[model samples]
Target: GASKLRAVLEKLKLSRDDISTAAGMVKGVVDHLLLRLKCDSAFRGVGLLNTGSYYEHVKISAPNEFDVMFKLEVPRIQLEEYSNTRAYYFVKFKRNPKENPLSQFLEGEILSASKMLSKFRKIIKEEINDIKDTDVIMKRKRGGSPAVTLLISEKISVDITLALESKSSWPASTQEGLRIQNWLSAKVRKQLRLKPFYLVPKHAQEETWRLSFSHIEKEILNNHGKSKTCCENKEEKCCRKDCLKLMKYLLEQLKERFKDKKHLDKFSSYHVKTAFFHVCTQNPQDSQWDRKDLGLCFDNCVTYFLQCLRTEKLENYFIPEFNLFSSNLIDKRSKEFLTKQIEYERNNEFPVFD
Candidate 1:
């Protein structure tokens, strides 16, 4: 379904506010997705950080600013031509023990990227066992899973923990994080015939606010509590009924507002569902898409709501304040702001957190 706000903008020729509001809604969706990707454990620790000699094998030094011995690299390979392969994407792992430490920072990626590492372990395991001596003696099968190669190296020991970002935000500049995650999974599977562990970020389960007409248990409690002292509060007994009535009324108003719009046919319950999904299901942990889903859902919802809000048919009976907490205007603007934030983060490599 077409966005109610879009319909209004087109019908009334309101360009500035319409554009601004639309942008805000898109921003909000991006913000929500950023939060999910950074928090989801599914992609946390499955990279080169867990590999043996990871620190010593890869080096990252900033001239006189600092020096670190621990490092690892995960690369995305592409075909240069028909037969040749070239590396395109890369994730560098480094640790600062004296300060914040790599152990703390890298843990999330370590846990999330575990599935990929496990595959690599299996490949090495097979190769090691296959290297038998000429004396007709087979190599002893090693203990532990294929993703790990334990050797008595003279390097410092580091522990692994499954953790995630605790806040809602975005984690990648482009689709690099997602790509890295997928590539690692494929590499591990191809190299070793082993099933990978699911690495979800610790923050993926964090909760946020959502609007659901069908599930108003909490709202009912709050409204019921207020009924004793106020007419609005006394109306608690009929809150559900009123809410439903409001929903229906709003839906009609939306139809009237966008009746002549070009893409009114595209607006449907599915669009409302999409908007609701974005608004409600956002967890701090998940993926960029998860965050994006939230914003997309919200903006779409507001777009529909706006369609109903601008209707002259409901002007006499409808009360905008009835749905204050779940204002379509705010939802639209929020999504746009989040989208801009995401764009900024894309230009600079960092998670978009707020």
Candidate 2:
């Protein structure tokens, strides 16, 4: 009986052999197999449905377990149909549809979405694995599928990329922003579906950035001096110079990747959503700023910016495509936890980050 239990455990990726009696061994093996079988059966395949609210709702149907669900929101105004359906079932199946559900209702939409997202999130927790990670960025809004992201491991991977904004200079005139906007617009048209995004920090008086790849180049160009642009400084001690170099590298890569129409189609599943963060806290002793007057801008930027963007941008981007969360500025531990959660969610694991 011990031998039999050992064999079964080995098959199920378990390595424990503490069962002392025949009955105990049998029970352990039976329990493990039952759990695996039930989990397989419960979630047959992930399913996605368009929520009335405009964001695509992801639903995972396990054979006997409960269903799971969540939303994929991006900044793009429109979402592609194929990305939505694909992301839904990717979570549901997790590579096998023959398994049995452990319980009738173990998970619902949000939980299922979380599970699916968590699994994929795990794959690319660090170093931006693929285009899907890049799509996980959010803006400030209420609800919409502006973008939908999916993290596919082994073969195709998707991850959203984002950049934070720091207040540096006066706001650019709306008219000037338009030129950069047009340049970005043309770029998007040339590339088809590669989504991009922008985020504005709190306390930024000109706080109306967006989450589309369509016109970001122009937008940034227009918004240039509002914060010193990406790279340009007369002084040698310049961070902007390196920043510009990075931006140039990204743009050049963008052009190279989008040059081939067929390649563009194949890469349609990719994205790089950039955002700007305006950290509100300053040294209390510094007379330049006052802590009391800072108000909610600090907290609001830290908490709601990402959530609001995720809720509002679900229509265009696939929700199950990626797991989105905000960074807590409270301390290093919290930031590390958030990063861990991001990795866990991306890999379809339970969010153990606290």
Candidate 3:
């Protein structure tokens, strides 16, 4: 079973030959799109931030998806959580947005996220129409999605998001989460503490803003290691990254390999990412992740995720209050289905991966 899983891991990684030119083309499309959007006065200060499985080097299969953030800097604002989603916020101005062009969109003390997103969304849509080739095609908006997903030459799917950036401190929910002290130093954590958190217009109604420490999220993964030398030197090789690839690969196959989608509806790659961080925290020493033990490492990671599935308690690393698999989000029938789906894959050596 271990060796069979190991063989599957070997096939899960991407190659330079596959993603090189494709990546360059997608980057070109996004860059030009950004330039076009920034030409509009309302989006002048926007800056781009790249985050996704592709950036983190954990992507499997085709490198066709992209996550690009156009950060909009906001003034010293207050955050009030809208109880409905438990993951969103309403951004309030200090004394105000009168100096800001965004003031027009501010509904009283609050900056209307939906309003801001709409303008940018419209701007990008117009830009796509403005810069279309007879052969090259880019598409439009999808319902209730924060992303303005653009298709690059019908090859890449890029999710361009409007992220509100603030230098203010993190919320109290963050105080007890992201338990990486064992994997990295407190000093390291301190520096990342004030790097600024972003509020993206996401699945919500009132508060309307969802937190994304996407910058920190990328930094943590790319440099994921207990020792400074981890993945940096040639003397050592850890299967840590391979474990993540397999874990991510596992979920994708399970999600796509089946007919019943509800079982994995609320399940997302973020849940898998969070699980990886927690598992890495459990084994802080880099040497424990020797490349030779890849199967065991992946199994260990899978074990933790399944445990979370059963308990229905995978906490968002940055927000302990958010249970990713909470009963409120995933129904009991779907939960049992997902649990059975994964268990069969494991004990039977993952036929889905085959």
Candidate 4:
């Protein structure tokens, strides 16, 4: 079973050439946007950061999807938290004599997500028209989605998000979250905390913003071990990333099997990622994830996720206040179905991968 699992992972691994091609195309789009936006007064000082599964090195099966954040630094703003979740915020701009150019997109100090995203979509369409590649299509905007989707080719799509980088202290809810101090030390935690958090143009209600932790997530995944040398060229490797990849692959298989079921639609790779983070903190030693013990390590991860679903207590890694398994997101029946499916896979050695 271990060898079979290894074989399946090998098959799922993406080719370097394919990844490079997709990355190059995405970079071109980003570069072009930066060049154009730099000249626009409304978008001065904007920066781009590569993010998402592909950039985080946990992407599986293919290198078709990419996420890039175009950020604009904003003045100190007041955030009104939405009652339902910590993920959404209503940003209120502070008064300044020199108002931000984005002020035009606001209604009485409240930032308008719909207006901002609509403007960004228009800019993307105008910019893509000037590019030489005619195959790149600007997808029509989806309601409440923060991204301006661009179809690069038949199988490739890039989600370009316009975000605001806030240097203010993180919200109170995150004070107890991100418990990586024991695993990565206090120094690392401080450095991570200093990094700015981002807000994306999402939420159905006007002036609401969705919190983004993609950059933090990318940084953590890239340096995921107790020591700096872990997974380095001359260091002992661990099966942490392999376990994550397998879990993601398993979720994808489940999604395919239950495509017609609406209850399962809420399940996604992010849940697996949150579970992996909790598992890492619980078992913070390298020996627990020894490379040679890939099968055992992966099984442990699966078991942890199964337990999370069964108990309906999977907390968002960045915001512990948010329960990912809440009834609104995933119901009891869906959780039971997933628990049973994962149990079967575990007992039968994950035949779903084949």
Question: Judged by lDDT, which candidate is best?
Answer: 4
RMSD for each of the candidates: 25.2, 23.5, 2.7, 2.4
> Tens digit of lDDT per residue, candidate 2, span 68-90?
12212211122112233222121
Instruction: Tell me model 2's lDDT, rounded to 2 decimals.
Output: 0.26
Whole-structure CA lDDT of model 1:
0.26
Which regions in candidate 4 have their CA more than 4 angstroms from the true location?
14-20, 51-59, 141-143, 233-235
Can you write out model 3's per-residue Cα lDDT over 1-354, one digit (the tens) per residue? 557666676555334234455566666666676788777777777877653323323346646666666787776778888774556787887664366767767888888877887787777766676765423354565433446776666556766677888888888778887788878888778878878888887763453788887678778877888887788876667878778777877888877766465567667677888888888889988877987777788888988988988888888888888888887777667778878988998888788777
Write the residue-wise lDDT of candidate 4 on 151-189 in tens digits: 887777877778888998887768888999888888998
Runs in model 3 deviating more than 4 A are 1-6, 14-20, 50-59, 84-86, 132-145
Index of the highest-TM-score prediction: 4
Prediction 1 TM-score vs. true: 0.17
Stretches of candidate 2 exceeding 4 Å from the true structure: 1-214, 221-223, 227-234, 237-338, 341-354
* lDDT score at residue 343, model 1, on the 0-100 scale: 44
**TM, every model:** 0.17, 0.18, 0.90, 0.91
Give the better candidate number (3 or 4) by lDDT: 4
Which residue pairs in candidate 4 have backbone atoms (N, alpha carbon, C) closer than 3 angstroms, thus clashing?
none
CA error at residue 36 for candidate 4, angstroms: 2.4
Candidate 2 vs candidate 3: which has greater lDDT?
3
